[PDB]
Amino acid sequence: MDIILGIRVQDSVILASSKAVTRGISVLKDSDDKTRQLSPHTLMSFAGEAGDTVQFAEYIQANIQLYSIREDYELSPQAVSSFVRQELAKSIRSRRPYQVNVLIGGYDKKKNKPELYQIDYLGTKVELPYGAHGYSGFYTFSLLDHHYRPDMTTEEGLDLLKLCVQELEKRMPMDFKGVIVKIVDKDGIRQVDDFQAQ
Amino acid sequence: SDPSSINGGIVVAMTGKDCVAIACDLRLGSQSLGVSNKFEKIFHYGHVFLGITGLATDVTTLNEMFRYKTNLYKLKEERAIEPETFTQLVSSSLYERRFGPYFVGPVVAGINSKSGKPFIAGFDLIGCIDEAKDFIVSGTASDQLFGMCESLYEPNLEPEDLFETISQALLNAADRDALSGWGAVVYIIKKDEVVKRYLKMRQD
Amino acid sequence: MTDRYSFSLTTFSPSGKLGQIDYALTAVKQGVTSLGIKATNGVVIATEKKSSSPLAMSETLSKVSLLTPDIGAVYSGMGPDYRVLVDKSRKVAHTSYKRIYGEYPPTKLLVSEVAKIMQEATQSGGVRPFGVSLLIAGHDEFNGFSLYQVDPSGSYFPWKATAIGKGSVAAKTFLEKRWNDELELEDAIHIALLTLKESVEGEFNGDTIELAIIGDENPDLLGYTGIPTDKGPRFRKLTSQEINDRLEAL
Amino acid sequence: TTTLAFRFQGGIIVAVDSRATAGNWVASQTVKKVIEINPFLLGTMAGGAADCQFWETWLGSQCRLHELREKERISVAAASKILSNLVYQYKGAGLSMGTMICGYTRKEGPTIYYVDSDGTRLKGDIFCVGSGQTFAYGVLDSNYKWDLSVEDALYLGKRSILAAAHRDAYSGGSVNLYHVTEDGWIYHGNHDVGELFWKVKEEEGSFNNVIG
Amino acid sequence: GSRRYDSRTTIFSPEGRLYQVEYALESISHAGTAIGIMASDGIVLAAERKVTSTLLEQDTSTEKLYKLNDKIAVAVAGLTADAEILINTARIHAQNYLKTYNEDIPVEILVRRLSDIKQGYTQHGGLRPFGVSFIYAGYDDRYGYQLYTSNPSGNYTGWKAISVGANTSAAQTLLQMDYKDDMKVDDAIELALKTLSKTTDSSALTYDRLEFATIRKGANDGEVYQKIFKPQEIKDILVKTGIT
Amino acid sequence: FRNNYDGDTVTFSPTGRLFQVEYALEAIKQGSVTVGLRSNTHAVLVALKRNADELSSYQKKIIKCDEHMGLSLAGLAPDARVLSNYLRQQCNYSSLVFNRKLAVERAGHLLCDKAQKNTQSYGGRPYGVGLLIIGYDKSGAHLLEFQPSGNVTELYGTAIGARSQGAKTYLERTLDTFIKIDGNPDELIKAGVEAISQSLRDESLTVDNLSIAIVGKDTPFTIYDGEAVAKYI
Amino acid sequence: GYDRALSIFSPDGHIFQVEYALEAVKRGTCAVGVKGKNCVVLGCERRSTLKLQDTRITPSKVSKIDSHVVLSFSGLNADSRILIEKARVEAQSHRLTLEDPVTVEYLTRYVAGVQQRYTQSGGVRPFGVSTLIAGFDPRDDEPKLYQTEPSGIYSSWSAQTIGRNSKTVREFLEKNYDRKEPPATVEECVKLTVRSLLEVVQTGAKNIEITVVKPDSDIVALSSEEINQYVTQIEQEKQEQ
Amino acid sequence: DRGVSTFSPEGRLFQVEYSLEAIKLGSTAIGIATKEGVVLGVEKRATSPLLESDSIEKIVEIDRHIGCAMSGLTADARSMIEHARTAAVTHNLYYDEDINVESLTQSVCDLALRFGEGASGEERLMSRPFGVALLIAGHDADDGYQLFHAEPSGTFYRYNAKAIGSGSEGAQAELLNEWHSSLTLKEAELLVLKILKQVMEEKLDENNAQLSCITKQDGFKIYDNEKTAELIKELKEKEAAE
Numbered sequence A: 001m002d003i004i005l006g007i008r009v010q011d012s013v014i015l016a017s018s019k020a021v022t023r024g025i026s027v028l029k030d031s032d033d034k035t036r037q038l039s040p041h042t043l044m045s046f047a048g049e050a051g052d053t054v055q056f057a058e059y060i061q062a063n064i065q066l067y068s069i070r071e072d073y074e075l076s077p078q079a080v081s082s083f084v085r086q087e088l089a090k091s092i093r094s095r096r097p098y099q100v101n102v103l104i105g106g107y108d109k110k111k112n113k114p115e116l117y118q119i120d121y122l123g124t125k126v127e128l129p130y131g132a133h134g135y136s137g138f139y140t141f142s143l144l145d146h147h148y149r150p151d152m153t154t155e156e157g158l159d160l161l162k163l164c165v166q167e168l169e170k171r172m173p174m175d176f177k178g179v180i181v182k183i184v185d186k187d188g189i190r191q192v193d194d195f196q197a198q
Numbered sequence B: 001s002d003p004s005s006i007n008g009g010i011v012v013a014m015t016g017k018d019c020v021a022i023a024c025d026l027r028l029g030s031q032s033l034g035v036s037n038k039f040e041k042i043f044h045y046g047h048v049f050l051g052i053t054g055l056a057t058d059v060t061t062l063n064e065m066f067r068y069k070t071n072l073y074k075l076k077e078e079r080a081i082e083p084e085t086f087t088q089l090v091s092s093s094l095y096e097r098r099f100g101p102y103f104v105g106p107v108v109a110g111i112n113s114k115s116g117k118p119f120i121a122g123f124d125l126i127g128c129i130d131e132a133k134d135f136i137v138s139g140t141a142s143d144q145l146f147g148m149c150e151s152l153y154e155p156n157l158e159p160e161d162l163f164e165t166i167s168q169a170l171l172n173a174a175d176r177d178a179l180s181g182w183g184a185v186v187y188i189i190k191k192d193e194v195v196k197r198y199l200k201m202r203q204d
Numbered sequence C: 001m002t003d004r005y006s007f008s009l010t011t012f013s014p015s016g017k018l019g020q021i022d023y024a025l026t027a028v029k030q031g032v033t034s035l036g037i038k039a040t041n042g043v044v045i046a047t048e049k050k051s052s053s054p055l056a057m058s059e060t061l062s063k064v065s066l067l068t069p070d071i072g073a074v075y076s077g078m079g080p081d082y083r084v085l086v087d088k089s090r091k092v093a094h095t096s097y098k099r100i101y102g103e104y105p106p107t108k109l110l111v112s113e114v115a116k117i118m119q120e121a122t123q124s125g126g127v128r129p130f131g132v133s134l135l136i137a138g139h140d141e142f143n144g145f146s147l148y149q150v151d152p153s154g155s156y157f158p159w160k161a162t163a164i165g166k167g168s169v170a171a172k173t174f175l176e177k178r179w180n181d182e183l184e185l186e187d188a189i190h191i192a193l194l195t196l197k198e199s200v201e202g203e204f205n206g207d208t209i210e211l212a213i214i215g216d217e218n219p220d221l222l223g224y225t226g227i228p229t230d231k232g233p234r235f236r237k238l239t240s241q242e243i244n245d246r247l248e249a250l
Numbered sequence D: 001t002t003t004l005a006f007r008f009q010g011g012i013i014v015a016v017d018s019r020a021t022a023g024n025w026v027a028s029q030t031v032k033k034v035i036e037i038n039p040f041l042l043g044t045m046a047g048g049a050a051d052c053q054f055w056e057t058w059l060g061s062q063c064r065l066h067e068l069r070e071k072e073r074i075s076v077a078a079a080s081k082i083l084s085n086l087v088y089q090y091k092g093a094g095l096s097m098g099t100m101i102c103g104y105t106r107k108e109g110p111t112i113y114y115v116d117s118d119g120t121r122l123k124g125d126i127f128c129v130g131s132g133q134t135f136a137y138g139v140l141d142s143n144y145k146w147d148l149s150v151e152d153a154l155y156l157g158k159r160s161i162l163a164a165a166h167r168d169a170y171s172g173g174s175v176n177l178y179h180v181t182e183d184g185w186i187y188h189g190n191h192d193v194g195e196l197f198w199k200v201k202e203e204e205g206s207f208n209n210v211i212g
Numbered sequence E: 001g002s003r004r005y006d007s008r009t010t011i012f013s014p015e016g017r018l019y020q021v022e023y024a025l026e027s028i029s030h031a032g033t034a035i036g037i038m039a040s041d042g043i044v045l046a047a048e049r050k051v052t053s054t055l056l057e058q059d060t061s062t063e064k065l066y067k068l069n070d071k072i073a074v075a076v077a078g079l080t081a082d083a084e085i086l087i088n089t090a091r092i093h094a095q096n097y098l099k100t101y102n103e104d105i106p107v108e109i110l111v112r113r114l115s116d117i118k119q120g121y122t123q124h125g126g127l128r129p130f131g132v133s134f135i136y137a138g139y140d141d142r143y144g145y146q147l148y149t150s151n152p153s154g155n156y157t158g159w160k161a162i163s164v165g166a167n168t169s170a171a172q173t174l175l176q177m178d179y180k181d182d183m184k185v186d187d188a189i190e191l192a193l194k195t196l197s198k199t200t201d202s203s204a205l206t207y208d209r210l211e212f213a214t215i216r217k218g219a220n221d222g223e224v225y226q227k228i229f230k231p232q233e234i235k236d237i238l239v240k241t242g243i244t
Numbered sequence F: 001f002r003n004n005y006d007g008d009t010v011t012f013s014p015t016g017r018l019f020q021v022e023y024a025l026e027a028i029k030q031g032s033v034t035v036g037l038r039s040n041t042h043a044v045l046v047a048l049k050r051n052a053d054e055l056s057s058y059q060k061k062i063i064k065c066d067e068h069m070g071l072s073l074a075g076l077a078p079d080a081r082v083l084s085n086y087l088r089q090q091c092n093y094s095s096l097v098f099n100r101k102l103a104v105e106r107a108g109h110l111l112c113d114k115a116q117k118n119t120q121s122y123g124g125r126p127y128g129v130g131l132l133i134i135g136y137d138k139s140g141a142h143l144l145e146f147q148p149s150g151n152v153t154e155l156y157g158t159a160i161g162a163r164s165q166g167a168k169t170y171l172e173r174t175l176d177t178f179i180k181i182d183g184n185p186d187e188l189i190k191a192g193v194e195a196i197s198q199s200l201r202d203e204s205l206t207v208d209n210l211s212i213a214i215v216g217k218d219t220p221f222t223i224y225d226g227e228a229v230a231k232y233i
Numbered sequence G: 001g002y003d004r005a006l007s008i009f010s011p012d013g014h015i016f017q018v019e020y021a022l023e024a025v026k027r028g029t030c031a032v033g034v035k036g037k038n039c040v041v042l043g044c045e046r047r048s049t050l051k052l053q054d055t056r057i058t059p060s061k062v063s064k065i066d067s068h069v070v071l072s073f074s075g076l077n078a079d080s081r082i083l084i085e086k087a088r089v090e091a092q093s094h095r096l097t098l099e100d101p102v103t104v105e106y107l108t109r110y111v112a113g114v115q116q117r118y119t120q121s122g123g124v125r126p127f128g129v130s131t132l133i134a135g136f137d138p139r140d141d142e143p144k145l146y147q148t149e150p151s152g153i154y155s156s157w158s159a160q161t162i163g164r165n166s167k168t169v170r171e172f173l174e175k176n177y178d179r180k181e182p183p184a185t186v187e188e189c190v191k192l193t194v195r196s197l198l199e200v201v202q203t204g205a206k207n208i209e210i211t212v213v214k215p216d217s218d219i220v221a222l223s224s225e226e227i228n229q230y231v232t233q234i235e236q237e238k239q240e241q
Numbered sequence H: 001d002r003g004v005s006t007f008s009p010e011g012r013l014f015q016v017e018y019s020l021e022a023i024k025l026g027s028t029a030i031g032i033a034t035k036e037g038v039v040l041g042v043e044k045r046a047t048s049p050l051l052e053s054d055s056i057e058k059i060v061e062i063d064r065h066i067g068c069a070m071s072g073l074t075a076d077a078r079s080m081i082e083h084a085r086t087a088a089v090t091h092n093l094y095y096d097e098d099i100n101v102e103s104l105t106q107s108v109c110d111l112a113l114r115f116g117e118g119a120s121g122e123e124r125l126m127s128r129p130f131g132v133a134l135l136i137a138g139h140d141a142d143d144g145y146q147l148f149h150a151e152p153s154g155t156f157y158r159y160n161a162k163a164i165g166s167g168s169e170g171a172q173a174e175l176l177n178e179w180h181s182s183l184t185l186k187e188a189e190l191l192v193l194k195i196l197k198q199v200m201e202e203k204l205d206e207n208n209a210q211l212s213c214i215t216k217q218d219g220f221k222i223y224d225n226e227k228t229a230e231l232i233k234e235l236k237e238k239e240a241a242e
């Protein structure tokens, strides 16, 4: 293990996810979007076992969308993350657990605060200013421990990501083919198309 | 391999003079990697306090489960659950999963609202109740906690003294455990009030 | 074979009555009088042992049953229906309460369980409602002493005092005159014996009358010693001799 | 096995080998590793012969069912997700398939999906699958342009399988070629490696190493 | 066989009505009236205890007002035993929601669910419906104070003020006349007691024949409080409003 | 009387009759006539097929159950499809498990027991079809009559359906002659076609109107229709 | 356990339980749908047996099944919730497996199939509900309107109405709707929809609700004032003659 | 009450017979089989001019070589078609070949008697018989162009020509006279259109009726409205010619 990073700045949550899909010996794809929009203001990134990954993400997506239609309302990021954790918590004691790790980034339109949730395949949840899954954190957590401020702008947060990705590109053994970066704020979810060279 | 050693974490409880205290560390880890330093392992239903050590996912699950059951209890009984009773509810709830247990070390602290009598208890992962008069210890530094407690402890301590004791017991046990620490929180429970203090400790 | 009665046998009639529940209550009306009275330091339940043969041994048929060490029951209506409700009440007190909080259920909750069992007989496929009304008396630490009536519909209500069955209307009236909130348990047993004498046709003694109390803990009735917090059931069935003693000061 | 599919200006090129092995035993040199799902849909086979052949023949039936039900051609996305979702039900049972679902609907344009028995489903322009995949990739990656002619594309496909048939012990026999446009797939023949190899060497100057 | 004795609880009448629902509704109409009034700063629930006696212990009693949540409560009109079955499942549903999302259940979600359970008894399983009508009083952070009503059909609707049980038509007319949108809780309390006092089928409206509750944002907290009125509290507030 | 006791198969009448079963029996009588008869070497089925219009097919009356066993039907055709199918499975089970051709007598007992279960249980119904079963087993040629009541009888000959009483009296009269018609298939069929024509009234038995079946010594159960029955008209 | 055949044939070949389910529809509040050239409008009446309701929280008559499809109905309210839920669930299921939202015809066929199933299954009664389903297929800019009934039959309509006095409003629409020239605009479509309800509702600012569905998931409900501005203008046409 | 699978004293199943009455109330459907194909026609019968008539689907494809027409409670036909399609596709999956028209019809008819409240024999969970009759038409290698009438009794008959629904007894007498083993496909189209025109209440046009055929070469086709309209021009011109 895909790179999965997240950072909560002043007014947004930024998610960066690696683009590579490698099966055994070959890199099959270099433009893979390891993310699902759960609702207009809630984004989920994921990494783990081959099939389980998308299967789990899409299943969560279907459920949140169902909720949205039934209630004509958008669940808070805290509610969505609690729902996801419970699903993973059941999963781990079933016949074949979902081997999927997730980051949930949401903008809570009720409070006006960004929120980042890290949940692993066991259903271990924690809320964080920044997080990662797999080996990513081994390089990135120290950079972020050093450079992170809670009042940082979205632009500052992107620079700090750029720093993290540079460190990963230098020291990680795998070629993860760069990241796709997405911002979650008051106005929704957008993709930075210019991270290949920013 | 050992679900009790993945996330790391300690909880300790003591009785004093007309008071009880319960403490935990704040670390949430994934083997060697520290993940969160804000992971509190003490919860409370009414005036009854519960700390859980062990696998974090089960720690969270069990909290949500006891909240659920104590809410229902209160609606039917029209009173808050008592420490004695809750201890029984924990035990039977854990034993219910005898051959597929929750990987946790629960700890109950509180003062009976009717009798004023201080109460603590500890459990194994399958619900065996240990109801000590002095202290209960739990977590990846339980050996260290037993050592600290067995020496530092004395009966009938005043809330302000009991605070100093339980804090030293926890702090010094945590610092000999790679998987415990990263912050610490202590609850001093008296009939009338409950005080909560975050301790200053090594961040390594 | 196979129960193919998967439909309700109790349904609403155009006027909105539930026929079978009414008819069950009618069966309760034909039943021997029973009554309960709540004192400050106890509760008494009483009824008449209406033996069906002088060849029958009336001790082998108790109408007053212990449900938990602090809770007792009595009824008016169909005896066999009552008996199975006692079996079930005793069991549910364990499965739904003791096996979960390590203590016996408070009176209201055990009542609440009984009532549910009776409600279900009113709605489930292929059954008839229970043909009984129960009086349940008990004690618990946090609610103190308490008397409850449970009817075939599954409804229950708390009482200071009441009577059910044959002479209930007369007996209820007699209790309204005699009841006050300062009654000691002995006084209540006295009121109970007076009230029941109006209902009994024949002999009125400790062999005919079945009476039980919920009062003080009885450590002599525990069967063991050594655990301070086990201070003995509060439920006590009075002996034939204990009744006759109070019938001389009547 | 080596199978490939790539998307270009002219649509989809699909090229596969035809070898089956049992250990070191060559079981067949004449396996049909392309399944014609419908006039506009192709599936490729890699891994377990039975698994692929059975579940892709089954896919055909599920697609035909769709068209009777919705009075319209199945989408490439929907077809692939059927096989994907089925295969995912069986995860861990030991199904062994590396598969490519290729088609040309109006709504999606020329479309390739990679589906395997791990439950992985990916959309893309270039895929090589099988034990000889890496060999096919070298040739394909170095000569691919969107702007290839139908003729050059067909040849690059055919030449890529030739590369893999040569180096990979478990690939070989013959090449089967397909071109896909909106009008439907067109078969472009069965080319035996035994004759294709010498032809290509002589005309191209490649395989200079081999004495011939 | 059995078919002989089947009342067929879930068929349509030729006029397209459901027999058992209608007869259940007829039973509800004889039950003690319950009133719900929503104000801007809170909600009121009031209900007349049907049939009473000197010996009925009112301190230990509850037949009409039930707590479902810390933020939701109901008033009952109909069979108490039937209501308790429904009340218990409602408490569970609330807790299931709370465990799933870590948020208290929005009032409508709970109401819709209970209404769905009732609707089912109307369409399959050949059982009699629950002889219950509910008034729901609750608060949540999406809609604020809310008042709902459900009946044996499994239909539910939202109200500023409503009544269930006996004499609803007279009571509805009275509430329609005196209710105003800018009402306070304290004014709502008075309206509910006036209305019950004007529709009782008893001589006079005494404390021992009532159950009373309020849902208030009690301003000094900046969080919502459910007050189930104790018998003495009803006796007091009955004097203040001028009924003695 | 009757109206109160004919609601289902689970109800006895005061005289001990089961009317639902008797009503099933009435569907047989309303069915088209079919005949069965046997020698010691062969067994023959002859059936008069019925059409709906002159634009309709004539509905098939003969079903094969195994290589040595088959049947003709009178009544509800779907019920015959269900019962022949069950018989097909029993014939099949005997072969796979025991490598044994099922005794015709044994097939008789199986059909009886299957029909019976539907005459004593609630929500079920009797079968509304009569069946004539012929076969050649280890004890020679056989003919069976199945009634939806469960009654199965072994016979030399019989007929069921509308106007069936004609052929039945013919067979009863012919008995001594046809029982001997061994080693000659065409003559046994001729006797069968002569039997079935004793039950004609409406119309004559035509080429696409006849259905005949034969089984015996060295003849696997075979169905004849149309052109192939021409030499018997 | 309970599998009694409640929907059976009677001697003349009718299924009374279905026929009676239709009677339940006839008692429901009226519902109407008209398709414009480039939109579909759904109109519903609000009853006046009782008034003192909370309109904020009371279940509205038009339901979103997905972002591009709406559903309205006449008949038993409770019964309709069961249908809406199954339809919403199916909509997400379709998006999950097909990777495309449902067509209006697909969704309509599903709801109708559920309705039919309840007319030949043991132990259940038919839905006392008829529905109008309206919207636009993914990536279509051709408006769709369908109707279902308790039997399970469904079909598409240029304009249709259901419920009490639907007979009246159908008449209006029949001699007022021209297929050659659908209402060219959202505005003249909404106006035709209100007009048809004004035949039956008999004075109704707060008694009429209107939902407008435009292509690509653009669905809006009108407020009382916006609706009342239509009622005001329509009654001026009558007096100017 | 009375069991759903009770016999009448005449030996008929009450529910099946009543079901047959429901079918008599349905829209007319007509099938004609020739050596050049089988034609299937139906009366659309819209209940209002606001109903978009082309959304009336009473002729459906089962497979490329089998189509069918329905009459009666048409909603009842959906699960019958679903079963038929599955049987056809399934057969092809198992046998790498087309299902025979007769085998397909038999499969559909097997569903028919699977109604009741628990009948001792197998699991018949369907509360009532289907209230729809079907005309199943197609081609196969062995027995050519075929027309079958599938009833809710589980029985099916093969027909040279057959009408079902409201005008069926009338239409059938007309078919009795008009059909011969030599019609061409064109003659059969015209003949369905003519018979449908007689029995229909409205004036038959290309909107209120629908034509279709199944030929060996092109499979099952539903004629679009423009094609049928020209056949309607054409039938009028020949009736006017004498």
Ligand SMILES: CC(C)C[C@H](NC(=O)[C@H](Cc1ccccc1)NC(=O)c1cnccn1)B(O)O
Pocket: D001, D002, D019, D020, D021, D022, D023, D027, D031, D033, D045, D046, D047, D048, D049, D050, D052, D130, D131, D170, D171
């Ligand atoms: C899809 C099949 C037909 C093609 C090839 N598979 C086989 O030859 C597989 C073994 C294999 C070899 C290399 C990699 C994976 C699996 N062989 C078979 O399935 C097989 C089937 N029948 C007889 C003998 N072998 B392949 O993917 O290299």
